[PDB]
Design a protein around this nucleic acid. Structure first.
Ligand SMILES: [Mg+2]
Ligand SMILES: [Mg+2]
Ligand SMILES: [Mg+2]
Ligand SMILES: [Mg+2]
Ligand SMILES: [Mg+2]
Ligand SMILES: [Mg+2]
Ligand SMILES: [Mg+2]
Ligand SMILES: [Mg+2]
Ligand SMILES: [Mg+2]
Ligand SMILES: [Mg+2]
Ligand SMILES: [Mg+2]
Ligand SMILES: [Mg+2]
Ligand SMILES: [Mg+2]
Ligand SMILES: [Mg+2]
Ligand SMILES: [Mg+2]
Ligand SMILES: [Mg+2]
Ligand SMILES: [Zn+2]
Lengths: 96, 91, 127, 25, 81, 150, 97, 226
RNA sequence: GGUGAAAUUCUUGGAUUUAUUGAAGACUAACUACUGCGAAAGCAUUUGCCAAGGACGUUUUCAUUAAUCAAGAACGAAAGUUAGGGGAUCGAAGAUGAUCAGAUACCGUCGUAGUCUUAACCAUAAACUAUGCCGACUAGGGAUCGGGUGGUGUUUUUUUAAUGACCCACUCGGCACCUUACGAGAAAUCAAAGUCUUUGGGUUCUGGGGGGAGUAUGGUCGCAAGGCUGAAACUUAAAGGAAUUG
């Protein structure tokens, strides 16, 4: 699955959470990948997609709402999108 | 403390109006007042406005749903049926 | 060189069925039953009555012009006994000896795939 | 008699006794 | 039988019988020394691996786990140890 | 006995009679102790520690190869987990199954097995509490189960 | 006292066997308890066979068969001259004819 | 029971065969025979136009009739008539089926039966539903007296059968498939595909049932009757 | 049409029937056997998804963490109850036809509730193997299911290899069965119902002649039907088990 990959990301590499932080990171291009929750507002999703294509960064559409995305990334609150700074030890960048 | 044994919310009706009726009204009022999921904004922030309305204080969207619940069994079945027919016809 | 029909012999209990049809089946011919040839209400399945029916239907088929026939023997079917009535074999013999031509005998009693419910109750018809 | 009918009769009798008792209290 | 020695029964019977029920219990496993095809790298492998152990030199494959004894790779030379 | 079942199956190791006497391995002890701690820093449990020592290397069993046992060594080097591995795995089992129930309302069989799991959890909790390896007043609860796992 | 080692059925390790229905008296009965029979008979007869053969196109055509499965209640099977009885020790016999 | 009618009328003679005439029936090309039989219908009056009532009639015929050999004794095929051309109605394929007696002989206990189905789509935009049936062997040198399966091999075999039917029907239109099943080349291919898993004798396929029909297309229909 | 036989009932307004179409709900045949799984009640069409389990293999880990259990809990056939849906077939009540002296019953034909599902209840059965659970020992036989080991063994793939399916040999754990009885019992019978006057492996539960009676009463659960707990007065010399001859 993918969730254990994200767990490896959390324990090993570097990341960031939340819309403001992710757009900030993507602004200087420190991001390698972004993951977007399903139920996010479509306007916001499209804007993030446009930023991604502008910065040549990969995007992955999670199969679920922000709530369980929060559980997958192993925090307690809900998260809209996540940005992967350094994979650290994960294969997410290489695969998919 | 468990203020009352089983009358629960309908304790406001005293000793009138009949046992079975009061029970049934309990069973409906619980749903009629509880929360649900603003699946759009993804949290527990919806209330009934009037018959069939449901409003999410977050995200400001109001969803027309069952008279006492966000969605009825008939609504679920018909939505599934529509989805099925659409896929089958386009394919 | 030959002209066929469809026999569709139905050998039920407490009666007997004989009627020849067009190969397409929509055009039926010479419908003769055990009851229409007897007044016993005991014999509407009897081999003798079936033999009478077979001879009569054979004559009718001969005059309408059909020479040979394809046999579909069929029992009560559905959820019921699925065993043919006594008269059916006698009727088939009688029609064979009556002069007609025969080919491609088969069995078409209807069997269900684990049907809904037999009548009779849990404890069955008792007597 | 058959025990099923015994218990049936006794159950009916219990119901009768219960209601005739409740008639006064 | 009514008379027979339990102290020195036949090794044929011993190998015949189950491992836990011998006169003194003992494992029926062993070790292997295997040469990875190509790179020599003689490796020590348990009989019933439960894991797909593979050579450090070239990590192609050595043995695949199975319900019984581990199933070794095709081109391999192994020695009972 | 299969304390929560009717099984009687037996399937387990039968270590050889020779206790401290392989006397046919070149590998010295420290080699394997630092190998173990090398694995441990990667976060492996003593079960697969022993498994990999048994497969990748020639190691009959740590208790004879070394002078002690794996968890003894981990405790000595200060890498002991806060809760024993078996109990940790059990609590994982419980959280997974209960999370399964949340969607599966009618799986009464799953509900059933939940009681068995939580029961063995409680009994092991009792044992560890009375051997003074868990803090007395230590209590397992469904609410804190998911967080206490990880 | 117990009459039968199997109690007159073939249930060992099951508990419930999803009964079936008598062909003759339509009574319900569990499958293992049934007195199941197989009827394999040719379609026409051994008497009319000569007649149909001599009056059959495609000489020696097929003479196809018939296969029915038969289920009876205990009382139907007994009154149908099927398995009438056997003596006390003879009951133990298992082999068919 | 001739005198049992106490009332024959809820409220209270002509010979019907003289108004009836014969019509010949014709098979398509993909059989060595073409003549089928003869059918009866009333006079095609100005109101009925008997061709209309005969537009969608159905018949059933043995394949041993279509190819002479009694080897295809059972092998039923049902045909829908579709075009009438001067007392010589033309027909088109409507279904293959197996016979009761043979198939209910095929089943004997002390073996495993396996069944599978598929709902493939043809190149002719036909929707065809196909059933497959199998019985194992007790091999030679076998001593055990029932020789059943293991219910996971059954899963593998049914998967393989499904995808084989899908592949062997897709791409093909209809007539090539008919000319496959008359010599049952797919029936032959099955045990080639499954032998390494389990014996599985008697891999006769089953009846096949059409589900959906495209436009009529008189042109290719007549091309069949060439 | 239906039986033994009739009969109620459908038919010229075309019954019974034949063919092509369509809908509805129920079920999961035949394969299905002294075979599988589950604590039990129970579970048989496909595919996918979610989690669970035994046995096997193990030179891995903990170290005695266990056995049975008052008090206390989970599940718990069908029938029955509440509120919707569904409501084909069958089908307590009921309607009707037939036998009989009578027949409110068996036999015929229809026919509400129910029979399916959802959300709650209800906790009972010959819930039977009428045999509590754990551990040890004591006679053979073949067969079978799942895992495992050995075999130049057969079959086929690509003769061939790995396979897979087979055959032989061994082993572990299952459902059983066959022969005998040292042994047990009153016997029927039993490899456990044995290892008990030569009377002691651990532990829970139940019974003390038959009726009165699972009644009265009192608590307690349930809306109810009812469940759980549960007497006495009085009466009686027999009821009962297994086998034998009639
Ligand atoms: Mg226990
Ligand atoms: Mg044991
Ligand atoms: Mg008796
Ligand atoms: Mg039972
Ligand atoms: Mg009509
Ligand atoms: Mg089936
Ligand atoms: Mg099976
Ligand atoms: Mg205990
Ligand atoms: Mg009881
Ligand atoms: Mg014991
Ligand atoms: Mg085995
Ligand atoms: Mg076994
Ligand atoms: Mg067993
Ligand atoms: Mg006493
Ligand atoms: Mg007493
Ligand atoms: Mg007696
Ligand atoms: Zn909102």
């Amino acid at each position: 699955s993918i969730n254990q990959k994200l767990a490896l990301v959390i324990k090993s590499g570097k990341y960031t959470l939340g819309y403001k932080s992710t757009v900030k990171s993507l602004r200087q291009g420190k991001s390698k990948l972004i993951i977007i929750a399903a139920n996010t507002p479509v306007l916001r999703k499209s804007e993030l997609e446009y930023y991604a294509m502008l910065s040549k960064t990969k995007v992955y559409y999670f199969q679920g709402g922000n709530n369980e995305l929060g559980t997958a990334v192993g925090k307690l609150f809900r998260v809209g999108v996540v940005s992967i700074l350094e994979a650290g030890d994960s294969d997410i960048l290489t695969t998919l | 403390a468990k203020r009352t044994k089983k009358v629960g919310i309908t304790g406001k009706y005293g000793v009138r109006y009949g046992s079975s009726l009061r029970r049934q009204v309990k069973k409906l009022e619980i749903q009629q007042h509880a929360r649900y999921d603003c699946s759009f904004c993804g949290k527990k922030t919806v209330k009934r406005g009037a018959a069939g309305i449901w409003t999410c204080s977050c995200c400001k969207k109001t969803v027309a749903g069952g008279a006492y619940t966000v969605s009825t069994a008939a609504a679920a079945t018909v939505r599934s049926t529509i989805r099925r027919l659409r896929e089958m016809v386009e394919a | 060189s030959q002209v066929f029909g469809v026999a569709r012999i139905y050998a039920s209990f407490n009666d007997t069925f004989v009627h020849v049809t067009d190969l397409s089946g929509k055009e039926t011919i010479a419908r003769v039953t055990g009851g229409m040839k007897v007044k016993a209400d005991r014999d509407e399945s009897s081999p003798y009555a079936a033999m009478l029916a077979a001879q009569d239907v054979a004559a009718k088929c001969k005059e309408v012009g059909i020479t040979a026939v394809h046999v579909k023997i069929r029992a009560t079917g559905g959820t019921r006994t699925k065993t043919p009535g006594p008269g059916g074999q006698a009727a088939l013999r009688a029609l064979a000896r009556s002069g007609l031509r025969i080919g491609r005998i088969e069995d078409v009693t209807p069997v269900p795939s684990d049907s809904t419910r037999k009548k009779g109750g849990r404890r069955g018809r008792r007597l | 008699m058959r025990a099923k009918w015994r218990k049936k009769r006794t159950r009916r009798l219990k119901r009768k006794r219960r209601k005739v008792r409740a008639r006064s209290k | 039988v009514l008379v027979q020695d339990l102290l020195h029964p036949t090794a044929a019977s011993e190998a015949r019988k189950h491992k836990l029920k011998t006169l003194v219990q003992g494992p029926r496993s062993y070790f292997l020394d295997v040469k990875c095809p190509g790179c020599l790298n003689i490796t020590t492998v348990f009989s019933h691996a439960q894991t797909a152990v593979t050579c450090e030199s070239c990590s192609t494959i050595l043995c695949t786990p199975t319900g019984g004894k581990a199933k070794l790779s095709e081109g391999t030379s192994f020695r009972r140890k | 006995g299969r304390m929560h079942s009717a099984g009687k199956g037996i399937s387990s190791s039968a270590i050889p009679y020779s206790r401290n006497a392989p006397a046919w391995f070149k590998l010295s002890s420290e080699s394997v102790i630092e190998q173990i701690v090398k694995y441990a820093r990667k976060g492996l449990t003593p079960s697969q520690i022993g498994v990999l020592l048994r497969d990748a290397h020639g190691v009959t069993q740590a208790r004879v190869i070394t002078g002690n046992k794996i968890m003894r060594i981990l405790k000595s080097n200060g890498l002991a987990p806060e809760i024993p591995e078996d109990l940790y795995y059990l609590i994982k089992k419980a959280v997974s199954v209960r999370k399964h129930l949340e969607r599966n309302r009618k799986d009464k069989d799953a509900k059933f097995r939940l009681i068995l799991i939580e029961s063995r959890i409680h009994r092991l909790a009792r044992y560890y509490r009375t051997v003074a390896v868990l803090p007395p007043n230590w209590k397992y609860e469904s609410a804190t189960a998911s967080a206490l796992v990880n | 006292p117990k009459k039968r080692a199997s109690n007159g059925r073939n249930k060992k390790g099951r508990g419930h066997v999803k009964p079936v229905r008598c062909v003759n008296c339509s009574k319900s009965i569990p499958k293992d308890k049934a007195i199941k029979r197989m009827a394999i008979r040719n379609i026409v007869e051994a008497a009319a066979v000569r007649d149909l053969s001599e009056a059959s196109v495609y000489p020696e055509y097929a003479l196809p068969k018939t296969y029915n499965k038969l289920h009876y209640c205990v009382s139907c099977a007994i009154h149908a001259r099927i398995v009438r009885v056997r003596s006390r020790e003879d009951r133990k016999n298992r082999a068919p004819p | 029971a001739v005198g049992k009618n106490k009332r024959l009328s809820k409220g209270k003679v002509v010979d019907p065969f003289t108004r009836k005439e014969w019509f010949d029936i014709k098979a398509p090309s993909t059989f060595e025979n073409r003549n089928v039989g003869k059918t009866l219908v009333n006079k095609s009056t100005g109101l009925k136009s008997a061709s209309d009532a005969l537009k969608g009639r159905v018949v059933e015929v043995c394949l041993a009739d279509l190819q002479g050999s009694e080897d295809h004794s059972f092998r039923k095929i049902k045909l829908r008539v579709d075009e009438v051309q001067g007392k010589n109605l033309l027909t088109n394929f409507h279904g293959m089926d197996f016979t009761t007696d043979k198939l209910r002989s095929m089943v004997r206990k002390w073996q495993t039966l396996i069944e599978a189905n598929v709902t493939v789509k043809t190149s002719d935009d036909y929707v065809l539903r196909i059933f497959a049936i199998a019985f194992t062997r007790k091999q030679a040198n076998q001593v055990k007296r029932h020789s059943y399966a293991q219910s996971s091999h059954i899963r593998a075999i049914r998967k393989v059968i499904s995808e084989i039917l899908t592949k062997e029907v897709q791409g093909s239109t209809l007539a090539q498939l008919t000319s496959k099943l008359i010599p049952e080349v797919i029936n032959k291919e099955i045990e080639n595909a499954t032998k390494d898993i389990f014996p599985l004798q008697n891999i006769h396929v089953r009846k096949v049932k059409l589900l959906k029909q495209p436009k009529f297309d008189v042109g290719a229909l007549m091309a069949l009757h060439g």
